[PDB]
Amino acid sequence: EIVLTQSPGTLSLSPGERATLSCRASQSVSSRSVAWYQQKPGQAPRLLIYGASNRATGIPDRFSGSGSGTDFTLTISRLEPEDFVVFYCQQYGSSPLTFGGGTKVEIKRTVAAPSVFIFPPSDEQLKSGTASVVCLLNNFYPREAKVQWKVDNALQSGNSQESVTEQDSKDSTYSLSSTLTLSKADYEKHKVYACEVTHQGLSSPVTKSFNRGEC
C-alpha cells in the first residue's frame, strides 16, 4: 500500500496570503490518481480536487492542485476566514485506498504570553474522597506549551491530563489546562503544590502555587 505523508503538520498564515500544501507518496501513483478533501471541525469532509488537477463542481476557483509521480500540491490563491481547517489527501492509483494525515491551517498572530491561574480543590469534591487540582493557561500563542505538576517539589508523571480549546474566533488564541487527580489520602498528606509553564513569549518560567488550608 502507498503510504501518504502530508507536511507541514500545521501551517500558519495571516488571511489573504497564499497557502500551499504537500502530499508525498511512498511510491509512484498511477495516472495522477490523487484527490483532496477539506473537513470543517465537527462536520463531514468535502471533495475539492480529483485526479490532482480537476476541480469539483461548485468549488471556489481559488482552489487549485497539480503534480504527478510521488509529489502533489494544493495551492490556494487567497485565504478566507473559512479556509483555516484540516485538509486531507487521498490516493486511488493502487488498491487499497489510503488517506493522508491531515494538515491543519491556523491564523497566524503576534506572540502572546499565557496568564497562569491556580485553583485549590473544592470541599464538596473532598467529601467524596477525590481531589482535583487544575492550573489554567489563558490567551496564549503559539499553541505549543509544556506544563508539569510538582507535589512537595516532586515531579508528577502518569497522573496528569491535558486539555486545550480550539483557536478562538475573536483573538485567535488558545487556552490550555492541566488537571491533577489525587485521592483524598494523597492530597491531605502533601501540603504544597505548584504548576509551571514554559512558553516562547515568557522569557523565564512563571510559577503559581497555593498552600493547602491557607484561607
Binding site: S33, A35, Y37, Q43, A44, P45, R46, L47, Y50, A56, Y88, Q90, Y92, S95, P96, L97, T98, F99, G100, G101, G102, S115, F117, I118, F119, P120, S122, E124, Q125, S128, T130, S132, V134, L136, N138, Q161, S163, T165, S175, S177, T179, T181, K208, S209, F210, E214, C215
Partner: protein, 228 residues
C-alpha cells in the same frame, strides 16, 4: 441532489456487533455508476476506509478490517448496511457513509463524493451516570491585574454530551468550555472557566447551568469566592 443519512445505536458494549444503515434519497442505488461505502474517523485522528458494495452485491473491504467487516445492500428500500463484529474501545469513532466513484474498466473504488452527515459511536461498558458539579471558586491566586477567573467543575459523567451555560446564556463573553477527556475509570470530565473582573466578584454571584440529556439530569450550582 443525492443525500445520505446514517442510522445506528450509538453506544455498544464491548464484544458485540455494530449495525449501521445508510439511507439514500435523491438517487437510486441500482441505476447509477456509483458504489456505496463506509468511512470512519477516530477522535483526534484521520479518515480510515472500511469497505464498499455494488448493486450486484460485490464488495471490497479494507485488508486490516476484512475479517470483521460485512456490508450488505437492500436495493428494494434503497439502503446499505454495515456490520462490524468484535467491537473494542479502539473502535470508537464517527462513521460516515459516502457515494464511491469507480473506474468502469476495472471497477475499483475512486474518490468519495458526496458524504453523509456522520454518526458518533462509543464502545464502552460503563453505565449511565450523572455529573458531579463542583465550584472552582475565585481566589487571589487566580486574580491578576484586577482580573479574576472562576469556573464550574464537572466530573464522573457518562456518556456525552454535557451542555454548560452561565446565567442561562446571559453571560457569553469570556466563556471557555474545555473538551471532555476520558479517564482511567472510563468516565468523562470537563471544566468550564469564565474570566470576569475582580471588582465584580462582590457584585454578581455567577451560576453554572449544567444539563445532562443521557441521564435526564439538570443541576445548577452557584460559584462564589471561598470564605477562607
Amino acid at each position: 441532489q443525492v443525500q445520505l443519512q446514517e442510522s445506528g445505536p450509538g453506544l455498544v458494549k464491548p464484544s458485540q456487533t455494530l449495525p449501521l444503515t445508510c439511507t439514500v434519497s435523491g438517487g437510486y442505488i441500482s441505476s447509477g455508476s456509483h458504489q456505496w461505502g463506509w468511512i470512519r474517523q477516530p477522535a483526534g485522528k484521520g479518515l480510515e476506509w472500511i469497505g464498499r458494495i455494488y448493486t450486484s452485491g460485490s464488495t471490497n473491504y479494507n485488508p486490516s478490517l476484512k475479517s470483521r467487516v460485512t456490508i450488505s445492500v437492500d436495493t428494494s428500500k434503497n439502503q446499505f448496511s454495515l456490520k462490524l463484529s468484535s467491537v473494542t474501545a479502539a473502535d470508537t469513532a464517527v462513521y460516515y457513509c459516502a457515494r464511491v466513484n469507480y473506474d468502469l474498466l476495472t471497477g475499483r473504488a475512486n474518490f468519495f463524493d458526496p458524504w453523509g452527515q456522520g454518526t458518533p459511536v462509543t464502545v464502552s461498558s460503563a453505565s449511565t451516570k450523572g455529573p458531579s458539579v463542583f465550584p472552582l471558586a475565585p481566589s487571589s491566586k487566580s486574580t491578576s491585574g484586577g482580573t479574576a477567573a472562576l469556573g464550574c467543575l464537572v466530573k464522573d459523567y457518562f456518556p456525552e454530551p454535557v451542555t454548560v451555560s452561565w446565567n442561562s446564556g446571559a453571560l457569553t463573553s469570556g466563556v471557555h468550555t474545555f473538551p471532555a477527556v476520558l479517564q482511567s475509570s472510563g468516565l468523562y470530565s470537563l471544566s468550564s472557566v469564565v474570566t470576569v473582573p475582580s471588582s465584580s466578584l462582590g457584585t454578581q454571584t455567577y451560576i453554572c447551568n449544567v444539563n445532562h440529556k443521557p441521564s435526564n439530569t439538570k443541576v445548577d450550582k452557584k460559584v462564589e469566592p471561598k470564605s477562607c
